[model samples]
Target chain A: CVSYGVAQIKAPALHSQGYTGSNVKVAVLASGIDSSHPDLNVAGGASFVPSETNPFQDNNSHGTHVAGTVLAVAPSASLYAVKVLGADGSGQASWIINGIEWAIANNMDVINMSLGSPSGSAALKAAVDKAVASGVVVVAAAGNSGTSGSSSTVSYPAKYPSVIAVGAVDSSNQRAPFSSVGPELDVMAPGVSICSTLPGGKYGALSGTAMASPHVAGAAALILSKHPNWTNTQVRSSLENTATKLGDSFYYGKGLINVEAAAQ
Target chain B: EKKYIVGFKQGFKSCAKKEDVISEKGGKLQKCFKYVDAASATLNEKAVEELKKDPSVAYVEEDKLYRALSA
Candidate 1:
């Protein structure tokens, strides 16, 4: 069982209108999620693992936790679970590629990739290239390898130019020890003890950039659901511009993701 | 197995031969298949076949070069 807590940030006023994500579609590409989890109740999904067994049946609780964060921001947004990683939290790059392709083909607006590898691949790059061209906003987790003072060796898909990489900061908004740092990083979010859905129909807390990625993903959904006409690039730029300036370091990039400010 | 596809159509020979296709525009050669039309088809076929041989390449196609002359 994994436990998570709501990110602690200065309470910006919650949207008075209650940002409705009624019609937006989001794809969560992660170590398979237990859609049956009460907290998740995933609206939809498509398996790309190609295995005889369904990968959606997750043993590790990472995906379930991430899914909870996504749904928290946009409660009504339809979720399409694309299981890339399997029970043991292991998967090949092709599994991830296939998951992303499936999400893009289904016309998902935002795809959350909470996993990555250090090395680069041409096929993965091409898939990302195509996804961006088709107006999809790709979000990924900053590695949890703890290189906070350095800008080099940021994790992949996160380091990939096509994605908006997210780092994790603790409850007090301090950088998490394990959260990787680099110029490719876009924003930070609450990940320490963050609470969300866990497998086997439970709730729990877990911490990592993996958990932080969904905060931005959820925020993007909130924005896109409201401003449906905005292009993918525009949405991305808006999120960047709206982030708080947490010091001047490139490690923080545009700073922490500020949904209240961003929605404005 | 998923079919990966790549398609190519030949660009205008005049501008392609020129040092700068962006600035110094060509007349009919500025568009696809305006110059070396026969060679364009052959190149397209070869490229497509080559791409298909790749274990990763799922599928490939060639586009009929849409040639246009300058106004």
Candidate 2:
């Protein structure tokens, strides 16, 4: 499952160092995970969706793909399938907040949030702020509500200053047309037609900032694995400061995430 | 009644329990959160107006549905 994005960020160099995020705990706060998928190993998870409360069950396939990208970058990082969204791939703010609380309580080192909306939520922001203060590196999608002109459409909790908002790029490092852009954008990652795990123990390709987020999530795990004593701020700054500059700061944020440089 | 999430005002996280806050503001409970100063409930227009002016309420947002932003 070696993809251009992984090599693009030089994850192989870190992987060779035996820094495959062996002990970091990542919580994928999406629909759920296909834990039975041969590629994923779920340490533990919980669902905020009352109807489909099993975190390992991802009927929507979104979380599995997000989890796939995380594992794709840091193969040994443990995943917690915190189901916030529902089988329909949509959810309320309360559900997402619930998932965040669960992730924080469980001591997940990183939280990958690939779901978002166009509007802001006070409750969502509060939970994100608390999660950040508690030491979890939270990464989220920049939403798919972009326009040709950069008018700031990045969604929450990615829009929150404390959360690392991830934008999307293609194999050629071009920003995806649908990847939301704004001042809040933290970094870009390969998202267009990126191949990774799907539900039912299968593999496939999907596109969006959703895919890009976990790439950073896994990248963060790699950094944390190498620097176990590092705080979330240190981990975030390392990624931002060492990012490979690609294009305008507005659309590309600090630039593409360079795991090889950050993991050092 | 519409589904809504009530956020407590700044520095008001410990002012009261989310459940009591909702009931006091005439909201039917959905779910109360622990980490964030917020709770989910069902509120009608009058309830929204009532909560909007409530001293402890920060903001009351309709519990809108959001999707996984994927292509």
Candidate 3:
């Protein structure tokens, strides 16, 4: 429900910020990315789906659409996909841990997680903790279901301190009806009704904090491209510091993500 | 009286790649066609036609023969 027109609000600002999103490395953890998809080039990836032939095919299209939004914002970023969720879009904690471990082992600069579980898996927690210790930035979607009334029930890895937990904001800067809200929520971005590429050479729109998390991941690429020497904390603070203030609202956590403001 | 079965293997040959089969009076030479990818049957026909149009092809046969396995 928390959806906005990125073209109307975010695109012009990103262009003005001089962030055309070129040549950064991003590892995407989800159903998978169509490497042959015109929107993305597959660098390398691993699949956790037990019997799947290749992680290259996306069944439900969630992972494919999410990858598209990030790539669109940062067209030049190289993408490494890890397929943890299967064709059904459901997976156990072990699957997520496998993906996180794979990214960490590969030394991916930025890893974007568009899915989450309630509690932390020991394996996943250890992997994420190590990645953060090594200065890899992990960005994750704050579960779409949350509220001030239900904030204490935060989703994990996103809920973990090592990961940047992202929520959703609608066009008016209001928390769209479904966006999760609480202290664990670190940032917010355009997450709903986002038009992006789909499987089989087609395009469609998707709505989820999954969509919002990548905007930050893409913005981080722009930041890293410019600074090149900034620490993970420095990169993140730049984003938090630069968010556009829409006043206190459920959807717009911190504020609307502003790349130019963050870059400066 | 003596009788024998005769067969002819008829297919197309290209200008560059050609093969021919000559049949003896009492021998059989069953003709077969090539298999193409999953494209419609029309594409298969067109491929054969293209081969037939090659200048090196002496003649092209419209139909080929196959074994009848059972009654």
Which candidate number would show the highest TM-score if scored against the true structure? 2
Off by over 4 Å in 2: B9-16
lDDT (10s digit) by residue, model 3, range A144-218:
665557445446678887888887766666665666676677778877678777788778777778888888888
lDDT of 3 at A56: 85
Task: Give the C-alpha miss distance for residue A144 in model 1, angstroms.
Answer: 0.8
Off by over 4 Å in 3: A1-18, A148-150, A249-251, B1-71
Q: Which 10-residue window of candidate 2 chain A scores lowest in summed lDDT? A: A1-10
Candidate 2 lDDT by residue in tens digits, A1-264:
545678887888888988999999999999999876875888889998979979998999999988988888999999999999998999988899989999888899999999888887888888999999999999999889877474898988899999999999999999999989888999999999988888877888899889999899999999999899999999999999999999998899999999888867
| Models ranked on lDDT | 2, 1, 3
Clashing pairs in 3: A175-A251
Each prediction's Cα lDDT score? 0.64, 0.88, 0.63
Against the native chain B, each candidate's TM-score is: 0.26, 0.77, 0.28
DockQ of each: 0.03, 0.81, 0.01
lDDT of 1 by residue, A1-264 (tens): 322222232212333466646677889887666857755657678665546246467666777778888887666777887877766565555556667778887889999888766765555666677788889989988777777354465677788898988888776667777877777888887777777777777876777788888878877887887788888898888788888777644556677877666666
DockQ score of the complex predicted as candidate 1: 0.03
